[PDB]
């Protein structure tokens, strides 16, 4: 099927000084946000009417309690052990955890953490594994976490039991949005000159969903190998934006066309002529 | 480590003077997460601006989308202004409808 195939939660915890920590959190299907997090109360914000998947209101409130208690508890402990771990302020910790459905029906779970914008730890087969970039600090951290009642068993249950249930349930609940096809618009412009006697031909494609798209400059049936694709960039409405540019001689533009192919446009390729 | 931000400015739809559109500023690839982003119309801060909740990529670098409804005109200049700890001064990226 099309659209997302993975669910994850993220954490960004910013430690300014011993007094001041802040945590930002959210839930995602691939790239699409489906939960927010109100930091001060420690509660979830459900961004879509199906963001609870097939879970009961009770199981959802219990998961929010787990994450609330984790976030405040973690922030407090970090602050209390910052001296021992020789931390210098300010510093920033990140986390990601979740699961992903593979083409054969297999669901693979993951958890990773970061410090200083570098790998710090991961969970591999139910254990805390320190990353090389985290050094002796990450070793200390993984040697310490096993001393806390219920932490490692809770992480195990959430990753390997709860997350796969949630993921299949929410991909099914949101399928009308998640597998919808939305057709792009496209248009041409002349970009900043790339040099004397040269033109930059720009083909813009905006408002497509899902994300995979194909865009090429052409001279009839011939692909122009000089096509440069930009980054796929987000619009705010669950669609994307992309440009494809071709640097061409000032007399060579005529006969050139931009061709767009997309899952929403089967039998309906967009072809746009420069002249 | 630290990472300076990439800044990309673009309209949602082709620009047509006097027609309502959405102006986007996508700021990405940066670390740490603290950042200040304003959209500007003729050098002055736009007040109504929406942004995404913080997210990050596989390499742990952050990204945000800032956006507002706007109406392009022939005279009016629009731009995104970013400040970050990694920049010795604020970076300003102009909107150009032909890029
Ligand atoms: C949609 C699905 C998607 C899934 C994908 C996500 C998939 C994966 C998502 C990952 C999210 C991880 C969340 C796991 C955290 C576990 C829940 C947060 C807690 C849950 C409720 C039961 C657990 C087992 C423990 C509880 C409830 C607990 O209360 O714990 C305390 C307990 O309440 C008390 C008896 O009441 O005794 C002790 O508390 C003392 O010591 C604490 C630490 O010093 C103090 O803060 C505390 O005030 C103090 O209390 S005191 O009264 O005893 O002094 C216990 O100490 C403890 O054992 C510590 C618990 C307190 C929070 C400490 C967190 C800091 C360490 C975090 C590092 C882990 C990151 C992952 C690394 C691999
Ligand atoms: C919410 O939805 C989840 C997922 O349910 C399914 O997907 C949805 C969209 C529907 O299409 C259902 O038909 C699917 O079942 C439910 O989780 C599952 O519950 C069913 C019923 O208990 C479980 O099926 C059993 O699985 C056993 C063998 O399957 C093994 O392989 C799977 C591969 O996914 C593996 O994940 C799992 O560990 C299994 O061991 C078997 O003993 C038994 O006869 C039966 O077939 C199914 O395994 C569950 N899936 C997962 C991924 O956990 C939830 O119960 C539902 N509600 C809530 C509240 O979560
Ligand atoms: C799910 C269906 C319905 C409910 C949805 C609710 C979802 C809403 C979003 C929830 C978002 C908030 C939760 C965020 C949870 C993200 C989990 C990612 C886990 C990874 C983080 C792992 C650690 C992060 C990496 C750790 C780095 C540590 C750096 C060293 C610090 C040293 C100073 C002290 C250290 C000692 C501390 C001792 C501790 C016991
Ligand atoms: C500790 O921090 C307090 C908050 O400072 C700031 O707020 C955070 C969110 C950051 O954005 C940071 O850039 C700001 O400077 C201070 O006001 C307070 O004085 C500090 N206290 C001590 C003892 O250093």
Swiss-Prot record, chain A:
It comes from the Eukaryota. Disulfide bonds join 99-163, 128-142, 203-258. It is a single-pass type I membrane protein. One of its GO terms (cellular component) is cell surface. The keyword Coiled coil does not apply. Expressed on cortical thymocytes, on certain T-cell leukemias, and in various other tissues. Residues 1-275 are extracellular. GO terms for biological process: adaptive immune response; antigen processing and presentation, endogenous lipid antigen via MHC class Ib; antigen processing and presentation, exogenous lipid antigen via MHC class Ib; immune response; positive regulation of T cell mediated cytotoxicity. It is found in: Cell membrane; Endosome membrane; Lysosome membrane. Glycans are attached at residues 17, 54, 125, 237. Residues 164-274 form the Ig-like domain. Keywords: Adaptive immunity, Cell membrane, Disulfide bond, Endosome, Glycoprotein, Immunity, Immunoglobulin domain, Lysosome, Membrane, Signal, Transmembrane, Transmembrane helix. One of its GO terms (molecular function) is endogenous lipid antigen binding. Antigen-presenting protein that binds self and non-self lipid and glycolipid antigens and presents them to T-cell receptors on natural killer T-cells. Heterodimer with B2M (beta-2-microglobulin). Interacts with saposin C. During protein synthesis and maturation, CD1 family members bind endogenous lipids that are replaced by lipid or glycolipid antigens when the proteins are internalized and pass through endosomes or lysosomes, before trafficking back to the cell surface. Interaction with saposin C is required for the loading of bacterial lipid antigens onto CD1B in the lysosome. This is T-cell surface glycoprotein CD1b. It comes from Homo sapiens.
From Swiss-Prot, chain B:
GO terms for molecular function: identical protein binding; MHC class II protein complex binding; peptide antigen binding; protein homodimerization activity; structural molecule activity. It comes from the Eukaryota. Glycans are attached at residues 1, 19, 41, 48, 58, 91, 94. Changing residue 60 to G: Decreases tendency towards amyloid formation. The modification Pyrrolidone carboxylic acid is found at residue 2. It is found in: Secreted; Cell surface. Changing residue 59 to P: Increases tendency towards amyloid formation. GO terms for cellular component: cytosol; early endosome lumen; early endosome membrane; endoplasmic reticulum; endoplasmic reticulum lumen; ER to Golgi transport vesicle membrane; external side of plasma membrane; extracellular exosome. Residues 5-93 form the Ig-like C1-type domain. Disulfide bonds join 25-80. GO terms for biological process: amyloid fibril formation; antigen processing and presentation of endogenous peptide antigen via MHC class I; antigen processing and presentation of exogenous peptide antigen via MHC class II; antigen processing and presentation of exogenous protein antigen via MHC class Ib, TAP-dependent; cellular response to iron ion; cellular response to iron(III) ion; cellular response to nicotine; intracellular iron ion homeostasis. Glycation of Ile-1 is observed in long-term hemodialysis patients. The keyword Secreted applies. Keywords: Amyloid, Amyloidosis, Disease variant, Disulfide bond, Glycation, Glycoprotein, Immunity, Immunoglobulin domain, MHC I, Pyrrolidone carboxylic acid, Secreted, Signal. Component of the class I major histocompatibility complex (MHC). Involved in the presentation of peptide antigens to the immune system. Exogenously applied M.tuberculosis EsxA or EsxA-EsxB (or EsxA expressed in host) binds B2M and decreases its export to the cell surface (total protein levels do not change), probably leading to defects in class I antigen presentation. Heterodimer of an alpha chain and a beta chain. Beta-2-microglobulin is the beta-chain of major histocompatibility complex class I molecules. Polymers of beta 2-microglobulin can be found in tissues from patients on long-term hemodialysis. B2M alone (not in complex with HLA-I) interacts with M.tuberculosis EsxA (ESAT-6) and an EsxA-EsxB (CFP-10) complex; the tripartite complex can be detected in the host endoplasmic reticulum. The B2M-EsxA complex can be detected in patients with pleural tuberculosis and is stable from pH 4.0 to 8.0 and in the presence of 2M NaCl. It is linked to Immunodeficiency 43: A disorder characterized by marked reduction in serum concentrations of immunoglobulins and albumin, and hypoproteinemia due to hypercatabolism. Patients may suffer from recurrent respiratory tract infections and severe skin disease. Belongs to the beta-2-microglobulin family. This is Beta-2-microglobulin. The gene is B2M. The chain holds residues 21 to 119 of 119 of the full protein.
